Amino acid sequence: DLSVWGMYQHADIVVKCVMIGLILASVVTWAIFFSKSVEFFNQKRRLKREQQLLAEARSLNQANDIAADFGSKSLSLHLLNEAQNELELSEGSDDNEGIKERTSFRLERRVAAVGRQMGRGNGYLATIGAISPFVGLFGTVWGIMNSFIGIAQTQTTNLAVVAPGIAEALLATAIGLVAAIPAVVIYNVFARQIGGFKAMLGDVAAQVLLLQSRDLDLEASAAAH
Amino acid sequence: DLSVWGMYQHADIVVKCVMIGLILASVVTWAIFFSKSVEFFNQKRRLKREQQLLAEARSLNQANDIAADFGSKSLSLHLLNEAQNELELSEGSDDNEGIKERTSFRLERRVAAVGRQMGRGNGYLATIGAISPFVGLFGTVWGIMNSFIGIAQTQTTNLAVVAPGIAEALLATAIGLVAAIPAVVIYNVFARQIGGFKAMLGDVAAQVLLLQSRDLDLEASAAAH
Amino acid sequence: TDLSVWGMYQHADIVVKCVMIGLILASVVTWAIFFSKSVEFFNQKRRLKREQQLLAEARSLNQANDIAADFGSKSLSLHLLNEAQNELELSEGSDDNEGIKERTSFRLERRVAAVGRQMGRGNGYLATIGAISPFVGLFGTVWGIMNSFIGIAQTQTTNLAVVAPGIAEALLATAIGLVAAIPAVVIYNVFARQIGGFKAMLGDVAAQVLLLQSRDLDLEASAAA
Amino acid sequence: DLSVWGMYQHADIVVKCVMIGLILASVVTWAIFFSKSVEFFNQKRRLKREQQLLAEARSLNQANDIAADFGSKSLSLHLLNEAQNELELSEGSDDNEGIKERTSFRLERRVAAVGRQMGRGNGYLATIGAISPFVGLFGTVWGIMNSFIGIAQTQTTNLAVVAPGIAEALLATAIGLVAAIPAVVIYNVFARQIGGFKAMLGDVAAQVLLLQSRDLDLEASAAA
């Protein structure tokens, strides 16, 4: 007795299900942390290399040639295809501003969509961070209740007879914060990572949008000669 | 007994770990304060001096001639190079309005990029100042548990028994606050400094856009005559 | 000899008496603001609903004036419609319509923002009371705790039964502190929601006025072909 | 006695009132969850299937022909027929960028209006989630204060005497926690689902503007 495992063994079913539910929320918090971090590091490391290549491009046709070997699922390749797709869907129209406007609008949505898709799992981290103190504390309150309702009927006088129950109760809020604090820290980290990546992807979207808007004006001048 | 060291070395291993972890969070917050503050002052001072010189310029050609002697990693010379580069890449165009939109869009991206770069360390500051209270609180809960475990083990209430648990709870609170207070102060000081600096950089960027735009409209007028 | 909720206030220290009076004054003003603001909000919302649903059938700005003319001088939609009419009245010499469309969009946006800002007039009290009344409660609480320990230090007794009345006053100061806090923070959120809903709905009427003006200008321009 | 009901019946008027207040808040929360989720799931599932059928379209009249068998309550048909209404209301006009801007403005208002109506209940969920802990705190303090007022009646004390008084003060916060916990979970579940719904509806409205803007430019370009 009088140790974290020995007191978990001699606890109340409801306090046990709180401690178990909190340990499950903790292991989910670490599972999603490793999974998401390994994805973001790979998506950032990729996109950085795509930008270091496309920073050398000087026309949209040259950007398509430079992008031609990039991985199918690469974000920069998708955007280059997004811009080129609008340029062929619009083929009959001499309204250049239209083409710039529709392309700008499409790229904007796709960047927002990638940023939102990259944030898929964060609702678990937000929920665990907000909720796990409350439930850990429900473990404390119920553990105090189900021990004090015992002394109310047993007419006890020695705080010691109830100190074991109070220790088992307070352990539930200790476990409460141990699930909560990682989840808040990790949610705040991934909010900053997504902000940084979505801005960096918006920079690669600006690079293709500029290349298109430049080439349309140059081609219009070459026609007007 | 001894005032702090004797009390710390007697503490439970879980509280020793919390204490050391918060002391590491304290030294990193002071390290990134000094490390970034001396950079920040130099970037503020240089940007102020560059702005004070550029403030007289009446054409973008004159703005290049006054700025060209700035240091190789000057922020203002970077924006003047950016606007001059958007013009030199566009030299076949007859539409000046496309040069204005592309230059505005490109300078807005570069101002935002330097804004992100200047914020580099703030994730630590904002996180530590938000969560070190709860890390201290977890340490207090462990001290409170250890007090009740003491009572349960001796079956008595003598002050000697709760003494180690309350000693732990005091130290874990004290170091929890000593980690929090600097991080909240330093985070607010840098939030204010970032707002001021990023606004100054936006004012220089707006001056370049004004000056380029006015020149393109005067060149168009002088041709049309 | 004995005490009650009132008798405890009747024996309390002058510092905490003054705090309790402060919270009861904060309570009666936060409810007086609620009933005053709520009766205005309901009548403004109900009026604007009837005015919008009645304007929804208009096909030109000239018809919208004839619909609105009997609304009354307090009408938000008659005000907005006039703002739109007055921009045409001041622009009578212009051949350019795009400038009129832009100026009207700018004016009506500022009017919609101004009405939204004007409805918030009392909210500084609700926000401040909700923020400070917890702290102001704690101060009363702490002062009562101090007076209880000062009572021991000045009388050399060691029986906790003389502390109990003193800390009952202290906990009462916290209790009344929350009774002032909770209504104020709930009601501040409620109105912040009702302001956002009303400001957006007024923006829907403003959009109808802009659309009517913009459309009828384009038809008036077409008639010159 | 030992029972939750018996100690509720024994408790002080203020804390009994707090327990009933928090129980009614727990009930409403759940009433909002079942009421919203059955409608929102059906409308999410509806809108996704509209987007599947529309995503292949290439001109605005073809998107109308695809939408022609959608129910009158379909948000995608509401947006499409609204873009067709901004054309028919100014058919006798050649200001193409005027038609684009008037349409873009109407669809922006419509997407915001549908999104704002989709969130109708969330104000209660957010408030019950954030504030029920403080209502539990007031309930407890009042019980704890009443227990020290009990100690002030006599020099005699034992923790067996205060036990039911501290147990009712605990029960007030146990009810506070059980009411707050669902409300925070449900609020976050709907906040994430609404963000996805806002995005789907926004991308349908974006497709309507793109279809219009191309087909309008291509029609105007036929004069060459």
Binding site: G123, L159, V184 | - | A164 | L137, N158, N188
Partner: peptide, 29 residues
């Protein structure tokens, strides 16, 4: 964004008050 993800620990005040009364009554015996 409308989601909530920050710690609220206010019910632990309730536990501290309950601990305070049981020390006050039981500890001096």
């Amino acid at each position: 964004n409308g989601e909530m993800h920050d710690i609220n620990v206010t019910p632990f005040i309730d536990v501290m008050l309950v601990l305070l009364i049981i020390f006050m009554v039981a500890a001096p015996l």
